[PDB]
Amino acid sequence: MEVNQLGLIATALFVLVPSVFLIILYVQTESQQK
Amino acid sequence: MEVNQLGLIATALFVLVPSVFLIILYVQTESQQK
Amino acid sequence: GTTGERPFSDIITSVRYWVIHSITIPALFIAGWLFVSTGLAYDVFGTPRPDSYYAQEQRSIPLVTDRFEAKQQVETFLEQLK
Amino acid sequence: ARRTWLGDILRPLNSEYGKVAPGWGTTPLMAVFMGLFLVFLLIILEIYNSTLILDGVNVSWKALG
Amino acid sequence: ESANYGYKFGQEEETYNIVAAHGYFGRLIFQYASFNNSRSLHFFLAAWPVVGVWFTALGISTMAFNLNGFNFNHSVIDAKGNVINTWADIINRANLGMEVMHERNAHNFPLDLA
Amino acid sequence: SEGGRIPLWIVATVAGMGVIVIVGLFFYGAYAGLGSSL
Amino acid sequence: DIDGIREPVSGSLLYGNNIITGAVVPSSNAIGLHFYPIWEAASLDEWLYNGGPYQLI
Amino acid sequence: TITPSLKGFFIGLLSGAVVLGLTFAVLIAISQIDKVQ
Amino acid sequence: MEPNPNRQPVELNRTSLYLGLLLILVLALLFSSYFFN
Amino acid sequence: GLPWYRVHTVLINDPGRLIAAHLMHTALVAGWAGSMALYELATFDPSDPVLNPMWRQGMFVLPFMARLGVTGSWSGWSITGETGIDPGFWSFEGVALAHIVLSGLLFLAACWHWVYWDLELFRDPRTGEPALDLPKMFGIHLFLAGLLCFGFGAFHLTGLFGPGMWVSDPYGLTGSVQPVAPEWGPDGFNPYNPGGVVAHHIAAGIVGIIAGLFHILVRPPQRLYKALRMGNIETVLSSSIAAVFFAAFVVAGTMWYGSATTPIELFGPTRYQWDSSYFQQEINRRVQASLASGATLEEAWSAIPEKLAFYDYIGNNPAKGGLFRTGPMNKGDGIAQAWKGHAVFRNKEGEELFVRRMPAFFESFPVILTDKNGVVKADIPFRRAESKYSFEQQGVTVSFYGGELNGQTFTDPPTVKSYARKAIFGEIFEFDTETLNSDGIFRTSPRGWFTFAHAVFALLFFFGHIWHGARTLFRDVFSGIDPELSPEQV
Amino acid sequence: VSYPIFTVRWVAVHTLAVPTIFFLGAIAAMQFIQR
Amino acid sequence: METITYVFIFACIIALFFFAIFFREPPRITKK
Amino acid sequence: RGWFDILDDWLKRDRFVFVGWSGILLFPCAYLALGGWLTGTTFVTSWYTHGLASSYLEGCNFLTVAVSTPANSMGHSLLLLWGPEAQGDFTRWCQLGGLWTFIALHGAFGLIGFMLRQFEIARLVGVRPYNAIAFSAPIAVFVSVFLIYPLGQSSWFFAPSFGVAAIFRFLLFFQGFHNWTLNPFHMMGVAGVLGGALLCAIHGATVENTLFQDGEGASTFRAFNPTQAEETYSMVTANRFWSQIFGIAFSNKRWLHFFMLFVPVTGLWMSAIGVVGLALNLRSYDFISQEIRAAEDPEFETFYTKNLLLNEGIRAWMAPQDQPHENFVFPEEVLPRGNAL
Ligand code: CLA
Ligand code: CLA
């Protein structure tokens, strides 16, 4: 339809970026010995 | 100019996704005890 | 579980209390009553009496239209009333 | 630690750590400018809000050249 | 260290000083206006919203039979009979706007009885 | 003259009716006052 | 056709709506309080037009 | 100079200090009438 | 160089990951409509 | 170990890496500035300062650079619209260039201070452990600030050794960079007088220099050092933030209400100018004057400068717009091309009617026409069933004076109504909607965005203050509490 | 115990207690105004 | 394009749901 | 020791109603705010201000009464009793709505004092200040709505007037003019308040029906140990319950309780930002893609377009008596209306 061109990338990076953040941590936590 | 609308997001995810992959590993490796 | 104050319970029960407040309470009441019933309140607060919203004919509102000369403008609004 | 040229030259400025004046030191003197500032703001505030008018000071786009 | 770790699932004793809690809150307002009984605290905690929402639900279920809110339109009138507006009236105008515009083409008659 | 004498349960039921009376006067005032509609 | 006046209100994503505007629209007013199970329609096309999904939900 | 609104400012700036005054007066006084330890 | 003694390790439990993602995703479901406007 | 939201506490007492950090931040903020500049220079159109000035093009950084002097481009053009001017090195390009470099250097600096974190300067000779004498620091820094504050007002704004600042008449028509002389009188406290911005920095600068010295010499009264947990950097923060958000709530207010600091020729009109019909009155005043000096209606209105008419258009009112109505004001109504002219509506009887304007509050508003006394004479009806004032029944007509449509008249209802429908927004203009592919829905000016952003950040920062402050006065009880059961019984 | 009278609690209690009754009295009177 | 984006996020939240309910960290008693 | 420490001593003395340093600010204001309201509610009118009866004395009931905002002429004037407007006069002040900025500004300081109190009492009693952090939420609401908002508009006149009904029109207004319900921030707002009133109810019930037996009575209230020791309810049982009925369930009272602070405080913070934006009128009014399709195609209809029409009606039929200073005159023929109604 007549939507915003950047809407897609704005939504994509809005979800990816912080999710990628959490994930990097969780996995590095998860793999700490002990 | 008269470029492709998805070009931006195609390039963004093409860089982000695999980079995010490597990074998740490197950090989880890096934090493994001993 | 305690502080200096005399436990309300004791006071609300002391015949001294009532001997004092049976006088004081209705006192305050009858005062405020008169405050309204004597029309004094209307003047203390510039509040319109049932017969003072509009002039007999006028059906327009006394809307204050400018800050600085407001008080002055308000006074004039009282002028049309009567 | 690791001293350095610049580091030594600046060494004095950062050393009097916990050094405090005794008692209520300068407090009272301070509590006055503080009250003065408080009044100063209320003025410039009330001037902007046209609550305190002052012939000579016309708080509009006018009074401009 | 996360202040949360200070709790283990399956503890015997409590994890907070409900006596210190009450001590602070009792001083904020005043003692007898503060809870010291965790059970009475939690009952209130549940009772309040549930009771309030029960009424809200009964409101919609009640206004479902057209027993609506208070109608103070043109209540306060002056010495001659003129209508002196209250905020209740400014509310009626906003309501009329909604009435008069909802369901543009659905009405064929004067009164909205449906 | 202190120490509880006037029985509490009476202080209440009296101060109580006393409120239903004033608050009730208000409700009557709603069909007569200025807040009327007549 | 929520209001039974043949004036369809589309409320689904694929038909021009976004999360905030989109919705599942109520059964027709032509239907009122009548029960409208799928087996009450000549077809699904008819059922989707009179807001059948609403009741099923 | 010293316009009507300027005079009012003082009236309020003065009427304000007074309130702070009587308040801290009364307070500082009653404070120093009991607190034994 | 001397191994800086001010560092601690960082942690994010599984539950936090979930609570995190739930927040990111729904915010995204809430704002995407206005991004596409 | 550490929760995610605490990872930065690893610096609470590592003055070295704290500076390394603060250096990186400055690098990014400087970097951003440099490149936000280039972005505007790569998209800003200087072709017309009258009807298409920076504030119509969603320019945000470009204005702050003009307010202090930089008003030219190495490519030849200039903000005021002149040619042949030589901005020298300090052109928008120059400024943008500078920051990008200052950023690269601060970066390298951040790196060095990170690796060489254990400089002795941070260790207390006495305790031999890391420590920073805050009280003396504050004095030092405060000294430098006032010293710089002073210079800025003393040499920059005054023109002694600098450009000056943006100064314009009462209707943003003449604006430019000009040297401003101080003003210690009372009217120098008037937000709209430039002289006050000068005096302030000279006086406050000095007071700032004095006060710094004081704090470099006099030490903090024990009572205070104890109360305000000084010597605990996480308190320097709680207070700064309180100041930073105070500064913020203020800049947000001067941007919205206007001041010699947020000039309209650079940030755009005020919602309040439209409210009080500010520019509408300046126009009339002028038009009636020309008629006095015996000019014709055509001549009078024709004398009205386009720029002036443009400010009298609700489409430049920052109060119109939306939160997700992105971009420059041009993606809305379009790039302004020319002033169609003043529209005068009249009805069969010759009577002159007037279009009730649109209050900023209303997204959509009705077309109503009244005479001088405010009597409704004509309008555009909803339900025609019983319309008494349709433009048709009234023979409403429209005539123009000065501008594109000057000297012309229109009488076919539709065309008359079209323009009436436009009169609602004030002066009628000619937009180019193609180029930017505009949609015709109002968007707000930079003045508006800056104001929204700072009012939020400020209100958000308040929470930071309350949080960090608390965390300073209760550090002890942080992590939890312990024993006894004292409560009621002093 | 030997409790006092005029206390801080008392002051407060009256700042709200006294005006209230004065208002309840005022209002009770309004119920009769008309036109 | 928009529809796809809306459905995707939704599909992602439901996936989360699954993992959260069936792949949480078993909640252990006393010892910790 | 000294007058200060003696002044302190006295203040921080443990009474029935703790005073404290904070009180020196709290009580003066808090009482004046409450007082001014109660005064106007029964005595002052809003005639010269909004052409409205607004007090008991005029005939208003607890719902219709209110302390209405000042005229629009006043602008953002602080309207001080002794300022250029009222000029020291009291009655005039009343008629010019001086009582609004009075209640507003006073109550404002009163919320500062109160939060300070929490902070001060917390410190004394030696507990963490999370009761103060929490209260930032209500401050933000009051600040953004009763101050920041109207500060962005033409004047105090458009700030919410203090009163029950007088607040409902504030609601209706925001729908009609700002289409506020469609705002991402207002939504978060409600998700928090609504979601917060859930945790409240849900946690309460989970506790009362997951209690251990510590008494022989049915009325289990008395069976409680005011003096800690064991958990009074089976945290372990609660976990299993929800873990089987909802699929997810707490298991760390420390987190379960922090969550309860977070949810509603974050919600109110968001609802504030949304309003800080409505000040500049930077609303979330429309969806452009929707409007464009509605223009070209007359058969496209969503529950959104529907709403916008409701707004048009609200604005057209209200504006007149709601914005008197605009001397609006909307001929019957110009008033938007559907068929028959
Ligand atoms: C800090 C203030 C600030 C301000 C006032 C502006 C203002 C402006 N910019 Mg700039 N900008 C900034 C910072 C700022 N910018 C930064 C840091 C960058 C780097 C990315 C840019 C990059 C930039 C570009 C590339 C462009 C602009 C343009 C513009 C103009 C845009 C009009 C618009 O569409 O706004 C839109 C405003 C919004 C969409 C704000 C909505 C925010 C919501 C959606 C989300 C908040 C986040 C999250 C969901 C909250 C949840 C929290 C949780 C706890 C619940 C405007 C004058 C444009 C221009 O010049 O056009 C001619 C342009 O092309 N800006
Ligand atoms: C102005 C300077 C300032 C500074 C130096 C700090 C510094 C700090 N804050 Mg603080 N804060 C501030 C302002 C500031 N704050 C304000 C205005 C608020 C109110 C919103 C808060 C609210 C706040 C809370 C509630 C908490 C802190 C905490 C902390 C500590 C966190 C350690 C960490 O690992 O961060 C972690 C930061 C992240 C993991 C990432 C955040 C990502 C999102 C939210 C934003 C991304 C933003 C984007 C990239 C750019 C933003 C630009 C900005 C201008 C808007 C740290 C010492 C924490 C603490 O006290 O720990 C002991 C804590 O719990 N702060």
Ligand SMILES: C=Cc1c(C)c2cc3nc(c4c5[nH]c(cc6nc(cc1[nH]2)C(C)=C6CC)c(C)c5C(=O)[C@@H]4C(=O)OC)[C@@H](CCC(=O)OC/C=C(\C)CCC[C@@H](C)CCC[C@H](C)CCCC(C)C)[C@@H]3C
């Ligand atoms: C609009 C509904 C609403 C009300 C009425 C309300 C009221 C109150 N909340 C308090 C507390 C709290 N509320 C909290 C979280 C929340 N509170 C919420 C919503 C509300 N909270 C929400 C949604 C949250 C979740 C974030 C916390 C965490 C606390 C506390 O710690 C505190 C408390 O102690 O709990 C009981 C009390 C603080 C007393 C005080 O500070 O006096 C000082 C100020 C005074 C006495 C007066 C000045 C205030 C001015 C602005 C008001 C003037 C108003 C007129 C008198 C009347 C207006 C008429 C109306 C019809 C408009 C107070 C009774």
Ligand SMILES: CC1=C(/C=C/C(C)=C/C=C/C(C)=C/C=C/C=C(C)/C=C/C=C(C)/C=C/C2=C(C)CCCC2(C)C)C(C)(C)CCC1
């Ligand atoms: C404050 C309070 C309260 C209160 C209360 C009250 C106020 C009450 C009242 C009550 C009352 C007030 C009652 C009454 C009753 C009555 C009855 C029970 C009656 C009966 C009757 C009868 C039976 C009759 C008969 C008859 C007659 C008289 C005549 C002739 C005929 C006949 C025969 C019919 C309470 C406790 C809760 C709690 C605490 C607080």
Ligand SMILES: CC1=C(/C=C/C(C)=C/C=C/C(C)=C/C=C/C=C(C)/C=C/C=C(C)/C=C/C2=C(C)CCCC2(C)C)C(C)(C)CCC1
């Ligand atoms: C090294 C070096 C160099 C260089 C440098 C450079 C080249 C740089 C660059 C830089 C840059 C290039 C930078 C940039 C930056 C940026 C930034 C910093 C950004 C930011 C952003 C943000 C922050 C965002 C956000 C947001 C969003 C997204 C949305 C909503 C809102 C907001 C705003 C929040 C030289 C040669 C000198 C030499 C030496 C060395």
Ligand SMILES: CCNc1nc(NC(C)(C)C)nc(SC)n1
């Ligand atoms: C245990 C702390 N005391 C306490 N007291 C009260 N009292 C009211 C009246 C607010 C329920 N509430 C709480 S929080 C549910 N806590």
Ligand SMILES: [Ca+2]
């Ligand atoms: Ca009579």
Ligand SMILES: [Cl-]
């Ligand atoms: Cl319909």
Ligand SMILES: [Fe+2]
């Ligand atoms: Fe609990």
